[PDB]
Design a protein around this ligand. Structure first.
Ligand SMILES: Nc1ncnc2c1ncn2[C@@H]1O[C@H](COP(=O)(O)OP(=O)(O)NP(=O)(O)O)[C@@H](O)[C@H]1O
Ligand SMILES: Nc1ncnc2c1ncn2[C@@H]1O[C@H](COP(=O)(O)OP(=O)(O)NP(=O)(O)O)[C@@H](O)[C@H]1O
Ligand SMILES: [Mg+2]
Ligand SMILES: [Mg+2]
Lengths: 333, 333
């Protein structure tokens, strides 16, 4: 009662939000790359310096951002991905909060450069001060977008403390890119660290062999034990690969990549079903190895549960669980 | 690119936020009770109808809300608990986002009634419409506050679907109150369902016997196996009770209540330390039974990690883990 109820200064409000969506450099990468994907990008180039605490640069050949919308992209609660509750209940894009960029710009030096196919001119924008004022200026840039995030946490001392070693932080980034690359085989992704290319996943052409990228990402060992899954029932569909439990190793078990309508996701319900199918087939229970993709009617899954979309909730939980169980169990025999 | 980047209508922006902090009636109870606690409340009366999907009423004898701040309490990003980054990095209150009430009012019919010790007059406020307009009107009410939340999710169809049975939903509420009652022995809490009292935890007086409430909440079985802990090192301090592992049952293992600076918390780091201490003492590894309280310098723990504060991150992780380990291991011998 001593302190009056008072609206929070813009920057601080954004920093509170950033603490919930941006835990480390890999988080910034996750959010920016998903934006590139939502933008229709086919090629995404990522440059990281000193694990990301120094610089994170992401360029894509997506549709770009119109000059008159640059500031809006840095504003709070502003998005082009949804505009109604109906849109929210039927999410068909990675983003929908209209918050990621504003959140990130409050805890770093973020620069947005972009040009659309209809523009001959490219522009650049960035926010500053307690009020997060945006300035827009001329720039050179092909069709698409570039995001530059520098000095992550330079203005938030306590959080910068949590940063691990350059190697460790980059490793999480590499793992994040790993998961994203497997979600979209039709997208080329290049990752560099301190001026050196660490990896490049070329997009898989039409009907091309997906095994190629799968093997390039998860390893030949997984590929040799990978059992293809094709299971469907109405809106529900399960695709991907599950390693034979009898030939799964602790190292392979490190591959437990799951997707729900293309979004990377770690769900206890799903993992339980998978493991149960393997347990009921194999002799004992263990950690399965898999890269699975669940496609389901957006109305049947709640994705508005975690600010970073790290969780989901299925309406017909028991049903979905049995679907995956049967699907996996089916292939194990 | 087809849809313009556009600021989200107020109500919808709040509904997106509500999806991340309010998963069910018990969540609404959690947020409102923590407000009552932050307000210095000594007695909190909770009335629930039909598991909370119909009505949730919480009254407290806290300090109240000044008439001219009623609207602000329903506004977004507005709080009296912090005002700077320094305040955020040294959290000493349950709330700090200035968002809970606004979020909840967007997905229910929420009414706020309150009067401060300096006011002879009491007032009532509530928000409405896509823009969340607030109206303030006269009311009768003692010193303190009352929150009324009706028809939870009446305007969000997909989410209302996730509601379980009246019994189930109330059960989560009861469990939430359980955890909160154990955090503050100095607070009286009464819980009723459909017009009937289900429980009432009278506050424990000065130096009074805490065992009383502990036994009333966790059961005599826990109390008979409860081993008191007193372990400290600088800012770090571990207090509470841990059941003898050799005499812990699956039923008792249901009691794994942990607190960090008074805030209920489920942390993997902490649970790991506890279990390890029990494992290293006992013969095998299992689920321990405990009600422990960790007090630590706010600067040493990040509580700005989850919108509902369901998680924390310790800066000196290895250290804290060893502190708890030693603390528990110490008593087991
Ligand atoms: N790489 C990009 N290419 C094209 N448009 C982009 C890109 N990144 C961001 N945008 C635009 O900027 C707006 C989004 O900023 P952002 O802060 O990421 O919110 P969001 O994607 O709408 N939702 P969320 O990610 O859930 O907060 C988007 O809605 C797009 O219109
Ligand atoms: N029961 C209460 N008694 C007195 N003041 C209250 C009570 N509930 C809410 N308030 C006031 O209303 C403002 C808070 O609304 P709320 O939306 O719960 O945000 P918060 O508690 O500030 N932060 P957070 O809970 O993290 O969103 C508080 O900061 C208090 O000033
Ligand atoms: Mg986004
Ligand atoms: Mg609050």
């Amino acid at each position: 009662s001593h302190m009056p109820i008072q609206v929070l200064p813009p920057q601080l409000a954004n920093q509170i939000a950033a603490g919930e969506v941006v835990e480390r450099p890999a988080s910034v990468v996750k959010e920016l790359v998903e934006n590139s994907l939502d933008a229709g990008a086919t090629r995404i180039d990522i440059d990281i310096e000193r694990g990301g605490a120094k610089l994170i640069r992401i360029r894509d050949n997506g549709c770009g951002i119109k000059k008159d919308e640059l500031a809006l992209a840095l504003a709070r609660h502003a998005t082009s991905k949804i505009a109604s509750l109906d849109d929210l209940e039927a999410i068909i894009s990675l983003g929908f909060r209209g918050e990621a960029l504003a959140s990130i710009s409050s805890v770093s030096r973020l620069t947005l450069t972009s040009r659309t196919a209809e523009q001959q001119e490219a522009w650049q924008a960035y926010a500053e001060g307690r009020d997060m004022n945006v300035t827009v200026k001329p720039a050179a840039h092909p069709v698409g977008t570039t995001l530059e995030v520098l000095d992550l946490f330079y203005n938030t001392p306590a959080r910068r403390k949590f940063l691990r070693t350059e190697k460790t932080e980059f490793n999480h980034i590499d793992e994040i890119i790993r998961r994203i690359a497997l979600a979209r085989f039709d997208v080329t992704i290049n990752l560099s660290h301190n001026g050196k290319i660490v990896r490049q996943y070329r997009a898989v052409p039409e009907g091309g062999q997906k095994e190629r990228r799968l093997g390039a990402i998860c390893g030949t060992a997984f590929l040799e034990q990978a059992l293809a899954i094709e299971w469907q029932h109405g809106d529900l569909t399960l695709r991907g690969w599950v390693a034979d439990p009898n030939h799964t190793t602790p190292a392979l078990a490190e591959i437990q990549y799951c997707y729900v309508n293309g979004r990377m996701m770690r769900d206890r319900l799903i993992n339980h079903a998978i493991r149960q199918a393997c347990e009921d087939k194999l002799g004992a229970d263990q950690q399965p190895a898999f890269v699975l993709y669940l496609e389901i009617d957006p109305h049947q899954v709640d994705v508005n549960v975690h600010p970073a979309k790290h969780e989901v909730r299925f309406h017909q939980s028991r049903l979905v669980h049995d679907f995956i169980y049967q699907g996996v169990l089916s292939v194990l025999q």
